[PDB]
Design a protein around this nucleic acid. Structure first.
Length: 131
RNA sequence: UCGAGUACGACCAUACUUGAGUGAAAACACCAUAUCCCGUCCGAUUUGUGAAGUUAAGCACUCAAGGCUCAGUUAGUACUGAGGUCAGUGAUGACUCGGGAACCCUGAGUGCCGUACUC
């Protein structure tokens, strides 16, 4: 029912004719599809690694399984962009069931109050909170 | 006698130009001279003609800097082709699908080869 599943996308940089064994990059992104995961996989590597989607290959994107469906806390360090105060990060600790669920509320909250939508939004540290 | 030595060169600064060092054989080099062609207002320049001589310059070899060449950045940045019944503002701004710099700075090193001769 909550959209925006959680994808585990990993990939080298088409090895290599120069380096012959480029370091593998893996990161987990929330996305509606996996085409949208790879689209934002090759945005981190184009920026945080200077690697094109052309000059590299996706090793194994994957759908993370779940957590036993039970309520718990979540602080989601989220970073959006807007003409509304360009590139501000946030914390916005939510209380939903799964990481997919809470990050959904994260997006539907920023697009609600900052009108920042999916591609203007990076995510980091979707972790939980005991108390 | 072996690397290089001259003179011919091809790439044309990694080769340039700087302060020096370096020159062991030859070989260039300055060098002697107006005794001739020579044209020098000049024996400077060059152009007759040879070896008392000299590494003083020149020249190649060494290090060791601007500059130059290769790269690491700079930077997936700027910029850009394409696409939005994108967002505001008629300021470009992000996004998506791509291309993708430069100056700089930290580097690397600071020529290479090709024909004849001569040893």
């Amino acid at each position: 029912k909550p959209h925006l599943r959680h994808y585990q996308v990993v990939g080298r940089e088409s090895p290599s004719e120069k380096n012959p064994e480029p370091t593998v990059y893996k990161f987990e992104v929330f996305a509606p599809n996996f085409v949208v995961a790879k689209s934002r996989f090759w945005r981190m590597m184009r920026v945080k690694n200077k690697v094109k989607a052309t000059h590299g290959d996706v090793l194994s994107c994957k759908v993370v399984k779940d957590a036993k469906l039970v309520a718990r806390n979540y602080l989601v360090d989220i970073a959006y962009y807007s003409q509304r105060c360009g590139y501000t990060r946030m914390v916005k600790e939510f209380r939903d069931v799964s990481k997919t669920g809470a990050v959904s509320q994260a997006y539907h909250d920023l697009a609600s109050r900052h009108r920042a939508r999916y591609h203007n939004i990076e995510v980091l540290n979707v972790k939980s909170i005991p108390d």
